[PDB]
Structure 1
């Protein structure tokens, strides 16, 4: 037979991640802009069982290794769009920069029809965290894309600088996407809040305990925002395909706000367990500390419920919930995207529930 024809060919760098895994789905929908799409998906681990049944060409590659990345990605002559949706899992500016440089250096010389590079960073562009994750200290929200860089180390700055330099030299278009806190479904993310809170709720249910809110008063009551992973995928695809969006820094959030107190009530309802909300006068406690000895409990839950096998430290990021629960004043603006014609949105309460439903559907959570 004949080789399949595609309109566009994606390289999704971080296909097992919270946004990469959504791109693996969204790119294959029949009405997705730029379709039909071929999808190459890169990650360091062997292809997990939960991605092996998707029509994605999986490439196992440690992208921090230059020779390996050249060997694995230089043959992919047909790539038209790169979606860089990865990070190394630390704040190290040099090691994160290596990963992204290796992707560009391996693909740019080999993919003659390459058009566009999408770089995913985040709203942490706009604020700093000090004192071991305990002092989140933002200025000037609602955050807009005209705000200047803070005079601090931030690997996002290094990634942007590489993006601008390499795309400019090679007559490629670029986009920088700055998602809000992501609501998604991947059980292999280093920062998946919905999975983290579903794991906590599951452990509470298993132990006949209430869903006890561990966070600060401020984070219980403040306005917060987030972004569905599928909306980030849609936004990245929009910028990849629509000429109006080219060569732009763009925030990405669901378009609305929510409060954690309301999310908490829904989470308890979803798991059929009692809620203990914020108690006046109580200081935040560490969810990471509450959960530090639960690896074996999680293993038993997996077995008892016949879940996809996951390790507690991989499916959940309790440390990340602890940061969320001492954060306030982090709202970002979607005006720039809307004014450029991107009117995608989600109802955040519905998005949170959609992610629970999906993780249950996929047997990541009971």
Structure 2
């Protein structure tokens, strides 16, 4: 075909990358019809080979490999950088993004826009070792921390300015999504926990803090992040803006916890007054084998426990509070996409069952 737009999705197996791969191929999608190149680290997993994306395995931290794999991609119009290296290292994250731009900018003559996805950590700090108060708005100045987001933005602003490309930064809230290859997928994580509770005839027992149980929290659906990125990539009113992305509402983990129990047909144990947070990472230490049994029993897409779940990240979610972000700027710019967070959560569950990452019920 000829296409209207050609996307390079860096991080296609990711929690947002995998949604963009679906969303960009819908016929109503702005800027369409879209060709999609999808970059990720590992060989194309099976679930993705059944999608119309041109998959490129590439270590994007390796400059020569990245040049050789992406230089030839002359038709690219829009880059969606929806990746990170899996640690908070400013240098290695920065290298990834620089490699992408240095490989594509000089070879793709119709390149228009670079979309960079970071996150609300911008506002409160990093996962190793202060915060702005919320609701977080986009104009809040950088914290004095080595946040790799600062380096990515600086690279973005430099490279796009000197090459007359447009840019956007997206700072999603906690993502409700479906990919089993993510390093930070709260829903799969909690789904795996519940699946194990069920298999071991235990209750869905809440391991988190009191505050996280009771405080207002927010999130974003992966598909909404993809729409928001696509919107900023094609709508000229949105160009060259930093932009938060959340579902537009708030929830409480306590209400989510109940729905999770109901979705797995098991009993729930809520937060208990005075009792304190225990580490779900520690509780799930040596469950790799139970998970390998479950995968085989239900004929699931095979995943290692440490791949599909990130219990450490759940622990952080469950000692967090006061992290609400504002969608006012996006709405004032005309983006009115939203989701009902309770429904988005359930819909991630359904979809992970649908795609056979977790057991049906």
Normalization by structure 2: what TM-score? 0.99
- TM-superposed deviation, 1:129: 4.8
What per-residue deviation string (whole Å, max 9, x for no partner) do you get for residues 116-140 of structure 1? 00000000000025776xxxx6332
What CA distance in whole angstroms lies between the structure 1 residues aligned with 2:346 and 2:128? 33
For the residue of structure 2 that corresponds to 1:35, the secondary structure is coil
What CA distance in whole angstroms lies between the structure 2 residues aligned with 1:186 and 1:131? 25
Q: 1:181 aligns with which of 174, 177, 192?
A: 174
What per-residue deviation string (whole Å, max 9, x for no partner) do you get for residues 279-308 of structure 1? 011010000000010001100000000000
What CA distance in whole angstroms lies between the structure 1 residues aligned with 2:42 and 2:127? 31
What CA distance in whole angstroms lies between the structure 2 residues aligned with 1:75 and 1:131? 38
Any conservation in 1 of the 2:125–2:147 contact (CA below 8 Å)? Answer: no
What per-residue deviation string (whole Å, max 9, x for no partner) do you get for residues 46-76 of structure 1? 0001101000000000000000000000000
For the residue of structure 2 that corresponds to 1:39, the secondary structure is strand
How much is the aligned-residue C-alpha RMSD, in angstroms?
Answer: 0.8
For the residue of structure 1 that corresponds to 2:49, the secondary structure is coil
For the residue of structure 2 that corresponds to 1:186, the secondary structure is coil
Any conservation in 2 of the 1:27–1:35 contact (CA below 8 Å)? Answer: yes
Name the residue aligned to 1:123: 120
Any conservation in 2 of the 1:217–1:278 contact (CA below 8 Å)? Answer: yes
Any conservation in 2 of the 1:179–1:253 contact (CA below 8 Å)? Answer: yes
Any conservation in 1 of the 2:15–2:222 contact (CA below 8 Å)? Answer: yes
What CA distance in whole angstroms lies between the structure 1 residues aligned with 2:128 and 2:326? 27
What per-residue deviation string (whole Å, max 9, x for no partner) do you get for residues 222-262 of structure 1? 00000000000000000000000000000000000000000
Any conservation in 1 of the 2:114–2:165 contact (CA below 8 Å)? Answer: yes
What CA distance in whole angstroms lies between the structure 1 residues aligned with 2:237 and 2:125? 31
- TM-superposed deviation, 1:18: 0.1
What per-residue deviation string (whole Å, max 9, x for no partner) do you get for residues 87-124 of structure 1? 00000000000000000000000000000000000000
Query: Is 1:336 the equivalent of 2:329?
Result: yes
For the residue of structure 2 that corresponds to 1:91, the secondary structure is coil
Any conservation in 2 of the 1:221–1:259 contact (CA below 8 Å)? Answer: yes
Any conservation in 2 of the 1:41–1:57 contact (CA below 8 Å)? Answer: yes
For the residue of structure 2 that corresponds to 1:150, the secondary structure is coil
What CA distance in whole angstroms lies between the structure 1 residues aligned with 2:201 and 2:357? 20
Any conservation in 1 of the 2:126–2:147 contact (CA below 8 Å)? Answer: no
What CA distance in whole angstroms lies between the structure 2 residues aligned with 1:253 and 1:49? 30
Structure 1 residues 72, 131: CA separation in 2 closer, same or farther (over 3 Å shift)? closer
Any conservation in 1 of the 2:170–2:244 contact (CA below 8 Å)? Answer: yes
For the residue of structure 2 that corresponds to 1:95, the secondary structure is helix
What CA distance in whole angstroms lies between the structure 1 residues aligned with 2:33 and 2:306? 36
What CA distance in whole angstroms lies between the structure 1 residues aligned with 2:25 and 2:31? 10
Q: 2:239 aligns with which of 235, 246, 255?
A: 246
- TM-superposed deviation, 1:81: 0.1
For the residue of structure 2 that corresponds to 1:204, the secondary structure is helix
Any conservation in 1 of the 2:38–2:55 contact (CA below 8 Å)? Answer: yes
Name the residue aligned to 1:26: 23
What CA distance in whole angstroms lies between the structure 1 residues aligned with 2:98 and 2:139? 26
Any conservation in 2 of the 1:138–1:330 contact (CA below 8 Å)? Answer: no
Matched length: 359
Structure 1 residues 175, 212: CA separation in 2 closer, same or farther (over 3 Å shift)? same
- TM-superposed deviation, 1:330: 0.1
What CA distance in whole angstroms lies between the structure 2 residues aligned with 1:297 and 1:162? 44
Any conservation in 2 of the 1:119–1:176 contact (CA below 8 Å)? Answer: yes
Any conservation in 2 of the 1:138–1:329 contact (CA below 8 Å)? Answer: no
Normalization by structure 1: what TM-score? 0.97
Query: Is 1:169 the equivalent of 2:170?
Result: no
